[PDB]
């Protein structure tokens, strides 16, 4: 058989949600796509040997309120929470995204995978212990990613599905 989950990515504006949704969508780097286009994706792949279909909801846009948004972070059933390690202001914004999730959401316990991307840069300002710490706080998983060379992609995406798993089976 298979399963189908439904997935959001969310981050400050130019860490690589999309150029993470494209490498696994597409499996190359993308490094210029329209930074206003939120829409979802669906990509079947095969994980730990069950076929997968994900639909991903990679967020754009703009900060001010949009209802199709708003309805499907409701449904959501994991979120990858995404900052770029050469970038501090987007490491400090994730506390404001999981709280939004939080709020949007009636369960207390939402699958959420923290990632901290462009682990190629070599220009780094978040240390991968700082984000540690966090993701600990949080009782979730931290993964690296490089959506350029496609280091932890499959890793991020695939961990979120095996923790919303973990929380299918509660
Ligand atoms: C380059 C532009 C870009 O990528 N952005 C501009 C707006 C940014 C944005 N990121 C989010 O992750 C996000 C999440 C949520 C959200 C809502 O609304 C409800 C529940 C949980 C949530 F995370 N809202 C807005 C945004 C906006 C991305
Ligand atoms: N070096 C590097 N650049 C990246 C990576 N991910 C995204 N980028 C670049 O970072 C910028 C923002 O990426 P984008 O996917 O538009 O971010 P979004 O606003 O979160 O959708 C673009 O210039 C991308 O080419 C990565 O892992 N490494
Ligand atoms: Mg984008």
């Known amino acids: 058989g298979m399963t189908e989950y439904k997935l959001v990515v969310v981050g400050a504006c130019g860490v690589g949600k999309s150029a993470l949704t494209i490498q696994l969508i597409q499996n190359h780097f993308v490094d210029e796509y329209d930074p206003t286009i ?77 990632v901290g991307n462009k682990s190629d840069l070599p220009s780094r300002t978040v240390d991968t212990k700082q984000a540690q710490d966090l993701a600990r706080s949080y009782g979730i998983p931290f993964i690296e990613t490089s959506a350029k060379t496609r280091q932890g992609v499959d890793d991020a995406f695939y961990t979120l599905v095996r923790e919303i798993r973990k929380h299918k089976e509660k």
């Not at 990509?43 to 948004?69: C, F, H, N, P, W």
């Open 38 to 114: 939120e829409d979802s994706y669906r990509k079947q792949v095969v994980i730990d040997g069950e076929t997968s279909l994900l639909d991903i909801l990679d967020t754009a846009g703009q900060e001010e309120y949009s209802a199709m948004r708003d309805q499907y972070m409701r449904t959501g059933e994991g979120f990858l929470l995404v900052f770029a390690i050469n970038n501090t202001k987007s490491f400090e914004d994730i506390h404001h995204y999981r709280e939004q999730i939080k709020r949007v959401k009636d369960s207390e316990d939402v699958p959420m995978v923290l």
